[PDB]
Structure formats: C-alpha cells, structure tokens
Design an enzyme around this catalytic site. Structure first.
Site, PDB file in Angstrom:
ATOM      1  N   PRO B   1      -0.541   1.335  -3.879  1.00 19.59           N
ATOM      2  CA  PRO B   1      -1.991   1.337  -3.946  1.00 19.59           C
ATOM      3  C   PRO B   1      -2.619   0.086  -3.348  1.00 19.59           C
ATOM      4  CG  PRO B   1      -1.097   0.839  -6.095  1.00 19.59           C
ATOM      5  CD  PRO B   1       0.065   0.950  -5.164  1.00 19.59           C
ATOM      6  N   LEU B   2      -3.924   0.154  -3.084  1.00 17.24           N
ATOM      7  CA  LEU B   2      -4.703  -0.993  -2.666  1.00 17.24           C
ATOM      8  C   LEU B   2      -5.604  -1.327  -3.833  1.00 17.24           C
ATOM      9  CD1 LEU B   2      -5.826  -3.124  -0.560  1.00 17.24           C
ATOM     10  CD2 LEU B   2      -7.324  -1.331   0.274  1.00 17.24           C
TER      11      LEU B   2
END
Lengths: 131, 131, 131
Positions: B1-2
């Site tokens: 994820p970011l």
C-alpha cells in the site's frame, strides 16, 4: 485526471517542472486526454519524508524518489494502465528520474465526481466530453 | 500500500519517523504484506493547517493530529480493517500519539493499479505475487 | 469526509482558514453531515507547484488556484454532488476565491474504511450513524 507528484526538494525547480511536463505528455499520449487536461499538484519533501522500498523484488532506490499518484475516472483497461506506467517512466528517464526511483498508483472515480470550475460538473452537463 | 501520513510540525522529526515505523510494522503484522512493502509520504504541517474534530462523538483532540490515509488493494475484510485501525493505534500510544489524536482512512484500488518501478505493473506481469 | 485542500502560500493565514470554513459549511449545508464531521488537511504551495488548466473548456484561472479533493463514503447521488460543487464555489466566492480558480474531485470508499480515533471503526460499531 488529478496527479499528485510527491518528490524530493533537492531536485531543482526546473527539473521539478520537467517531471510534471513529462508526466503530462505521457498521459496525453497514452490516454489521449485533451492537451489542456492538466491538473497537477507538485509536493517537494526532504528525502527523509518519502520512505519507498521494493516490495521484496530485489532492488534499491536513491533518495530522489518520485511518487506519482494518478486520480482518474474508471474505464481504462489493464493494458492501457500498463502503457501509462511504461510511458511515464520512459519520459522521466532523460530528465534524471531513474526507473528504480519511480512509483505509480492509480485511484479511480466516476465522471460525475469532477468539477473543473464555476461549481459546475462538466461531464454531467456534457460541456466536456467523457473520454 | 501507499500511506500518506499527515502530521504536525511540533512533532520531532525523530518522533515522525517512529510514527511512520509503527504504522508500517502494524500493517505487516495485520495485512501480512511483504516486510519491504513500505511506501509512505510524511507531510508535517503548521498544526493550524490540519483541522480534525470528533464528528460529534464527544471528545477533544490536541493540535497534534496524525491523519493516516491508507491506499491499498480491494479485498481486505471488514474485520481485518478494524484490526488494522486497532493495531496502528496501539503502536502509536508508547510513541507519543494519544488515541484521540489518530484518524485513519482507507481508499481502495486494484492490483493492476500499481507500478513499483521500471515502467512495469508487477502484480500483472507476475513479478510480484498478489497478496 | 476527509478533505484535502491544496492552495497557494500567498493566501494569508486568515484566508486559508476562511477557505477551510467555507468548504466545510458547504458540506454541512448540502450533505447534512454532523457539524463536527470536520477533517481537513491544508497544504500551501508556490503557485508554480499547482498546475490547473481548463481541459479545453475555454477559460483562464489566476495563479491563486484552490484544489479541493473530497474523500467521502459512496452513496451520494450525482445531483447532490452537483449541488456540493455549487455550494463550495458559492461559499468561496466572498472569501476571495473565484469560480475560475476552484477544482474539485471526489473519491469514495465505504463506511467500514474509517477510524475517527481510539483504534475503532465507528460506522461499523454503530457508535456513529451511517449518513
């Protein structure tokens, strides 16, 4: 589309802008959006602010990471998104952004989710043709 | 994820980095993402630039708000996300972030919406296994 | 909702907060969210790091552009969205933000994608009512 470019403040203002110009040129090329459909927020950070590793693939980056987050309406195929990634990265190679230092994310919405100005939703009214 | 971690300027650069460490370690424990699946952007603001209230819940926050916005692939259950909120928030307590001062949002996409470098979409090609 | 407002550094402290107030009052007026469902991140940029053209619609903006990015759970209708775009812009007008200089994007998620604090998911637990 709305592009968020979070990069490092050690890059010059000129290169910073050239990154933005190269991200846009590629999107126009692949997506075939209007030439003036340019909506970008550039954020420059101390390199300590961007933590970006490899997901265990097996490569390291320099501190000059460029995160490009693409906000765009649903409908583009897997292969078109692959072309986006490849075209952005190749446009950014000559301007001093290494392939290893590039990270791209896409987040989708619908056409009725956009207001280009004047409190008007232009895709809904049909003032602006949907891609 | 970011992960976009938006926090405040009064927090020491040391503490910010520890905040960012705790959130990552929480994600790796709960989501079981690769250990080097680390993609974070820290933005320290003048506290007056961040305005976070209680949605009428009946509690007060200090100025030093920490907003964590998680951009991840679709498919995590309701229960796992709850477990992610909880684990991030217990991680931050010993570091200097009160329970009242944490706010978390998740925005979802697809495996074909990521590029980790080199112009490639690694979940699509098979370079990286879909989690 | 969580709102990201990106504007320029030449706007005073007072104007930024009034821009943030006008946007919030808009969402309460149109969405009937709780008065205190307020979560806003302001980021100020040199007018050069915000690039917002017109998509070929045929208008010019000033350097003093404001980009408002709304993160809200799905369920709101197209018309309510149109009505939000209208409300935000009409509210910003007397605050010194012209119609030409406002850009809005919505990004949606689910109720179960929010933690307002205390490592808890308030829509999930029934603690906060699904709007």
């Amino acid at each position: 589309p709305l592009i968020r470019i979070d990069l490092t403040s050690d890059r010059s203002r000129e290169q910073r802008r050239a990154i933005a110009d190269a991200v846009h040129d590629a999107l126009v090329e692949v997506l075939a959006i209007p030439a003036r459909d340019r909506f970008q927020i550039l954020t420059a950070h101390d390199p300590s602010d961007i933590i970006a590793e490899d997901a265990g693939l097996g490569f390291q980056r320099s501190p000059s990471v460029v995160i490009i987050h693409v906000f765009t309406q649903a409908g583009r195929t897997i292969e078109t998104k692959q072309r986006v990634f490849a075209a952005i990265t190749e446009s950014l190679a000559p301007i001093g952004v290494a392939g290893s230092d590039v990270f791209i994310a896409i987040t989708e919405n619908a056409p009725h989710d956009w207001s280009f100005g004047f409190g008007s939703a232009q895709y809904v009214t049909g003032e602006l043709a949907i891609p």
